[PDB]
Design a protein around this ligand. Structure first.
Ligand SMILES: NC(=O)c1ccc[n+]([C@@H]2O[C@H](COP(=O)([O-])OP(=O)(O)OC[C@H]3O[C@@H](n4cnc5c(N)ncnc54)[C@H](O)[C@@H]3O)[C@@H](O)[C@H]2O)c1
Ligand SMILES: NC(=O)c1ccc[n+]([C@@H]2O[C@H](COP(=O)([O-])OP(=O)(O)OC[C@H]3O[C@@H](n4cnc5c(N)ncnc54)[C@H](O)[C@@H]3O)[C@@H](O)[C@H]2O)c1
Ligand SMILES: NC(=O)c1ccc[n+]([C@@H]2O[C@H](COP(=O)([O-])OP(=O)(O)OC[C@H]3O[C@@H](n4cnc5c(N)ncnc54)[C@H](O)[C@@H]3O)[C@@H](O)[C@H]2O)c1
Ligand SMILES: NC(=O)c1ccc[n+]([C@@H]2O[C@H](COP(=O)([O-])OP(=O)(O)OC[C@H]3O[C@@H](n4cnc5c(N)ncnc54)[C@H](O)[C@@H]3O)[C@@H](O)[C@H]2O)c1
Ligand SMILES: O=C(O)c1cccc(-c2cccc(-c3cccc(O)c3)n2)c1
Ligand SMILES: O=C(O)c1cccc(-c2cccc(-c3cccc(O)c3)n2)c1
Ligand SMILES: O=C(O)c1cccc(-c2cccc(-c3cccc(O)c3)n2)c1
Ligand SMILES: O=C(O)c1cccc(-c2cccc(-c3cccc(O)c3)n2)c1
Ligand SMILES: OC[C@H]1O[C@@H](O)[C@H](O)[C@@H](O)[C@@H]1O
Ligand SMILES: OC[C@H]1O[C@@H](O)[C@H](O)[C@@H](O)[C@@H]1O
Ligand SMILES: OC[C@H]1O[C@@H](O)[C@H](O)[C@@H](O)[C@@H]1O
Ligand SMILES: OC[C@H]1O[C@@H](O)[C@H](O)[C@@H](O)[C@@H]1O
Ligand code: NA
Ligand code: NA
Ligand code: NA
Ligand code: NA
Lengths: 257, 257, 257, 257
C-alpha cells in the first residue's frame, strides 16, 4: 500500500485485460492512476470502482488526444512518475500473402507509434520526477509467431525502441524497460480463440504452450510493472519475460530428409 | 564460382556499400544478380563491370516499382532464388525530443515496409524454387544505440519479422534469415561521421567498438549472405551477427550512488 | 513487511556483499532467513543484528555441510520456501594461458556444483511448499568478459542450468529463476580492484560501464530476489538483468583493415 | 575444393556423427584434417577413405593424450589453423533427483574441460597462423531441455566460454566461435531414442520439433563450420544456430489457474 505512494501513473489501454490488471496493481501500491482508453465502457467503471484511479478517454493513435492526456494528468495531479504503454492489438491470424502494407501501417500506428508519442510527450515531466517508462511488448517479438508478420514486427520494434530510449534517457536518471508477456488470459485472447475453427482446442493449446501448464493473469503482469516502477532502480533497458516458461525447451513446431 | 550457379538473386540497395559487396559475392558464387537501387550512379556502373549482374532502377518504398522489379526479373531470367533486402538508411544522430512521428513513419517505409513489400511479391516465385530471403538488419536492433530511436526500432522490427516469416514459410521449404552487421565501413558510415563535431574521433571510436579493433567490410557481409543462401539448408529464422564482437564484454557506456 | 510473511528462505554466501543485501531484503519482507556462509565473521554479526535471521556455518562445496544446512533449516523452522544460491567467487584477472584445468575445476565446484547440490537437497521441501529457487549468475555469462575464461564458463552454466531445472520442476509448481547482476559494489569488487595496476582507474571504468554511470547496490539485487520469490508467479526460467544497462549500445571493446 | 586449401584442421570426436560430417566438409574444402577420437573404429576407416585426413587416437579428457595430439599435428603437418571441439556426450534422460554431482563432474570433464584443454594447448600455434576455434555447443544451452540438467549446464558453459575466449584472443587475430545445433540425426540421437519407451514416437517428436519438419544432417553442421573457419573473418564470439527453427514460436511445452 506504500511501495509507490505519492506517485502518478498513466496506463494506456487500461480499461480491460492486462491494462486493467496493471491499473489495479498500481492503485494497490498507493499510486494515483490515470486510466487511458479509446473505449469508455471498462475504464469508466474502473474509475468508479477504484479510489485513486480516474478515466481519461484517449486514442493513443491521435497525437492531440495524447497531448491532452498528458496536460490533464499534470493539471489534475501535479506530477508524472510512470507511463505504462499497454494499448495494443493482435489481428486475427493472417498468412503473409493475406496481409497488406496498409494493415501493417495501421498496426504500427497503434502498437509502436502510440507508445512513441505518449513517451515523447511525457519525458519532460518524467525527467523532473526521475520517473520511468514501461512498455508492454510480447514474447513473440523475440521468438516469432506463425500467421502474424505485422504483429510480430511491431513488438520487435517496441522491445528494441525500449533499449534505444533507455540509452538516451540514462543521463537524466529516467529508466525505460519493457515487459514481454506470453499467453495471458484476457478479452483479446478470448476474442481471437472464438474466431478459430475449434476455439476450445486453441485455448487448450494456449495453456499447454507453457511448462507451467496454464495461461498467465493480468495481475501477474501488473506485479511485474509495479516492480519495475518502484524497486528496480538499477534496471534500464531490460525485457522482463512474464511467459510461464513458453520460450524454454523443445516443443511441437511443425528423419533428416 | 559454382556454389550458387544457375540461381537468380535480387539485391536491394545494391549500388554501393554493403549491397554492392553482396552483389559481388553472389556474382563470384556463379549467380545472376539483379541490382536494385533508387540511385542510378553506382548500380549502372556495377552492371557494366560485372558479367552476370544487371541494374534495375527501383525505389523499394514505391510498391509499383517493386512489382516491376519482380516481374522484370522473372521475364529476363526465368526464376528467382534469393532476395536480399539490404536497402535502408540511418538518419543523423537525433535525441528523442528531436525526432518526429513523421520522420519515424518515413524511416519505417524504407527500412521495414520496403523489405516487407519485396518479400511479399517475391514469395510466390521463391516457393517454386525453394528459395530463401535474407534481410539486412543491424546489431543495434538487438542491443540498442544512442540518439537513434527510430532507426533502432526499425531494425528490431526487421529481425522479429524475419522469425515470423520463417515460421510461415517453413512448410514450403523457403528459409528466411537475417544478418545483423555492426560497424561496416561504407559510404553511409563515412557520411554520418562527416557531420559529427570531430569526424576523425568518431571513426576511431567506431574501430575500437569491436574487440577486433577494426570495422568490417562489405565483402564480409557478402560472404555471410552467400553462406545463408547456398549452404545453410537447416538454418531458418536466424540472426547472423557480423559485428567483430562489438556485443561482447563490458565497455564505456556512460561508486554505487 | 508482509509480502513474504511466514516463509523460510536460505541465502548462501549471505555474510557480506550481495548475499547480505538479499538477506536484508527478505527479512524486511517478513520472511525468516537462514544465512549460510563459509566465513563466520559477517554472518554471525548479521544474525545478531536482524531478528528473524540466523546463521549456519556451511561451505557449499562440502556436500555434508549442505545436507546439514537443509536438515537444520527444517528442524528449526518447519518448512523451506526459497533457496538463493549466491555463494560464488571471481578469480583475479587471468589470461587464458595463465589458467589451469585444476583452477577451473575448483571454481566449478563453488560457482556451479554448490548451487546444484543445495538445490537438489532442497527440492523435496520446495515441492511441498510450492517454493522457488533463485540463482545468482552474472551478466558476463551472457556477453563474456576479458581475462576470465573459467568464471564466465561457470556463470554460463548457472544460467543454462536454471532453464533446465525450470523445465523439470514446472509440473510441481516450483519455479527456478536467476538474476544476472552487472557491476555491483561489494567487498569482492573492491578486492579485485585493489590488485589492479591502478585501482582508482578500474573503479572509474566500472562505474562508466553502465549507461546509468554508477555501480549497483546489494539492496537492488535483493529487491529483485524478493520480487522473484513473492510476486513473480508466472515467471520461471528467466534471467533477470540487474546491470544498469551495461549490455546496451556500443562501447570501447578494443578503418576496415 | 580451394576455400580452405593449405590449412590444417583438428576435429575432436571426428569418427562418426557430426564430427565426421565436419571432417568431410573440411576435406572437401581443401584442408588437411586430423581426426581425433577415443574410439578407433570409425576414425580409422575415415582415414582410409579420405585422402588428406589422418586418424590420431586421443581421449580429450586425458591431458597428455591432447598434448600428444597437438605435438603430432605440428610434427606431421607443420602448422595448425583450426580446432573444432566437437567431442561430447548426452546422458540418458535423467530427472534432477536421479543425477549426481559425480556424474555431473564426469560430464563436465568431457563436454567442457576437454574443449578447454585442447584450445589452450593449440592457441600458441593458432596465434602464429591467425587461426580460429570452433566449439560445438547445443541449442539447449540457450533454451534448456527437460531431464538434462548436467548436459544443459555443460553447453551453457561452452557457449559462454566461447565469448570469453573470443575477447581474450581478439588482439592476436584469433577468432573463437561456436555452433549450436538442434536435433541432428546421428548415432547418439539414435542411441538415446532406442532406450525410450516408444523410440519411434521419440523420433517423430524430434522431427516435428523443427518448423522445417525434419532433423538436421552432419553435413549441414559441417558447412557451417567451414564458413566460420574460411569466410567469417569479422565474426568472433558468435553462436551460429543450426537448428531448423526449433527455437521459434510457441509449441507444446507442458485457463489461467
Ligand atoms: N493477452 C496476451 O496474451 C498478450 C501477450 C503478449 C502481449 N500482449 C500485449 O498486451 C497488451 C494488452 O493486451 P490485452 O490482451 O490486455 O488486450 P485487450 O484487447 O484485452 O485490452 C486492450 C485494451 O487497450 C485498449 N486500446 C486499444 N486500442 C487503443 C487505442 N488506440 N487507444 C487507447 N486504448 C486502446 C482497448 O480498448 C482495451 O481496453 C497489448 O499491447 C498486447 O499486444 C498481450
Ligand atoms: N554500415 C554499417 O555499419 C551498417 C551496420 C548495420 C546495418 N547496416 C544496414 O546495411 C544496409 C546497407 O547500409 P550501407 O552502410 O551499405 O548504406 P549505404 O547508404 O552506403 O548504401 C545503401 C544503398 O541503398 C540504396 N537505397 C537507399 N534507399 C533506397 C530505396 N528507397 N530504394 C532502393 N535503394 C535504396 C542507396 O541508394 C545505396 O546505394 C542498411 O540496411 C543499413 O541499415 C549498415
Ligand atoms: N559484485 C559483482 O559485481 C557481481 C556481479 C555479477 C555477479 N556476481 C555474483 O554475486 C555473488 C556474490 O558476489 P559478491 O560480489 O557479493 O561477493 P563477496 O565475495 O563480496 O561475497 C560472497 C560471499 O559468499 C561467501 N562464500 C564464498 N565461498 C563460499 C562457500 N564455499 N560457501 C559458502 N559461502 C561462500 C563469502 O564468504 C562471502 O560472504 C557471486 O556469485 C558473484 O559471482 C557479483
Ligand atoms: N546430435 C544432436 O542432435 C546434437 C545436438 C546438439 C549438439 N550436439 C553436440 O554435437 C557433438 C557431437 O554429437 P553427435 O550427435 O555427433 O554424437 P556421437 O556420439 O554420434 O559422436 C560423438 C563422437 O565423439 C567421440 N567422443 C566421445 N567422447 C570422446 C572423448 N572423450 N574423446 C574423444 N572423442 C570422444 C565418440 O567416440 C564419437 O565418435 C556433441 O558435442 C553433442 O553434444 C549434438
Ligand atoms: O503472443 C501474443 O502477444 C498474443 C497477444 C494476444 C493474443 C494472442 C493470441 C491468442 C489466441 C490465438 C493467437 C494466435 C494463434 C495462431 C496464430 C496467431 O497469429 C495467433 N494469438 C497472442
Ligand atoms: O549500427 C548501425 O546499424 C549503423 C548503420 C549505419 C551507420 C552507423 C553509424 C555510423 C557513424 C556514426 C553513427 C552514430 C553515432 C552516434 C549516434 C548515432 O545514432 C549514430 N552511426 C551505424
Ligand atoms: O561481472 C562480474 O560478474 C564480476 C563479479 C565480481 C567482480 C567483478 C570484477 C570487479 C573488478 C574487476 C573485474 C575484472 C576486470 C578485468 C578483467 C576481469 O576478468 C575482471 N571484475 C566482476
Ligand atoms: O539437443 C541436444 O543437444 C541433444 C544432443 C544429442 C541427443 C539429443 C537427444 C536425442 C534424443 C532424445 C533426447 C532427449 C529426450 C528427452 C529428454 C532428454 O533429456 C533428451 N535428446 C539431444
Ligand atoms: O476475458 C478473459 C479474462 O480477462 C481478464 O482480463 C479478466 O480479468 C478475467 O476476469 C477474464 O476471465
Ligand atoms: O566509403 C567507404 C568504403 O565504402 C565501401 O563500400 C567501399 O567498398 C570502400 O572502397 C570504401 O572505402
Ligand atoms: O565494500 C563495498 C561495499 O560492499 C557492500 O556490500 C556494502 O553494503 C557497502 O557498505 C560497501 O561499501
Ligand atoms: O545413425 C544416424 C545417422 O548418423 C549420421 O552420422 C550418418 O551420417 C547417417 O548415415 C546415419 O543415418
Ligand atoms: Na476513482
Ligand atoms: Na553486367
Ligand atoms: Na537474528
Ligand atoms: Na587419409
Amino acid at each position: 500500500g506504500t511501495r509507490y505512494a505519492g506517485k502518478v501513473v498513466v496506463v494506456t489501454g487500461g480499461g480491460r485485460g492486462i491494462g486493467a490488471g496493471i491499473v489495479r496493481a498500481f492503485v494497490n501500491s498507493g499510486a494515483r492512476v490515470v486510466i487511458c482508453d479509446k473505449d469508455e465502457s471498462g475504464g469508466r467503471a474502473l474509475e468508479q470502482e477504484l479510489p485513486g484511479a480516474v478515466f481519461i478517454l484517449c486514442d493513443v493513435t491521435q497525437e492531440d488526444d495524447v497531448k491532452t492526456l498528458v496536460s490533464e494528468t499534470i493539471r489534475r495531479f501535479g506530477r508524472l512518475d510512470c507511463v505504462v504503454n499497454n494499448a495494443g492489438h493482435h489481428p486475427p491470424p493472417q498468412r503473409p500473402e493475406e496481409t497488406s502494407a496498409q494493415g501493417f501501417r495501421q498496426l504500427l500506428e497503434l502498437n509502436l507509434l502510440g507508445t512513441y508519442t505518449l513517451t515523447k510527450l511525457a519525458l519532460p515531466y518524467l525527467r523532473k520526477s526521475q520517473g520511468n517508462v514501461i512498455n508492454i511488448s510480447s514474447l513473440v517479438g523475440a521468438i516469432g509467431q506463425a500467421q502474424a508478420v505485422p504483429y510480430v514486427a511491431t513488438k520487435g520494434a517496441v522491445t528494441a525502441m525500449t533499449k534505444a530510449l533507455a540509452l538516451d534517457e540514462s543521463p537524466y536518471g529516467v529508466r525505460v524497460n519493457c515487459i514481454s508477456p506470453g499467453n495471458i488470459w484476457t478479452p483479446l485472447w478470448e476474442e481471437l480463440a472464438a474466431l478459430m475453427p475449434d476455439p476450445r482446442a486453441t485455448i487448450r493449446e494456449g495453456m499447454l504452450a507453457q511448462p507451467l501448464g496454464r495461461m498467465g493473469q493480468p495481475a501477474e503482469v501488473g506485479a511485474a510493472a509495479v516492480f519495475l516502477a518502484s524497486e528496480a532502480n538499477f534496471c534500464t533497458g531490460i525485457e522482463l519475460l512474464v511467459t510461464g516458461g513458453a520460450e524454454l525447451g523443445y516443443g511441437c513446431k511443425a528423419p533428416d530428409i
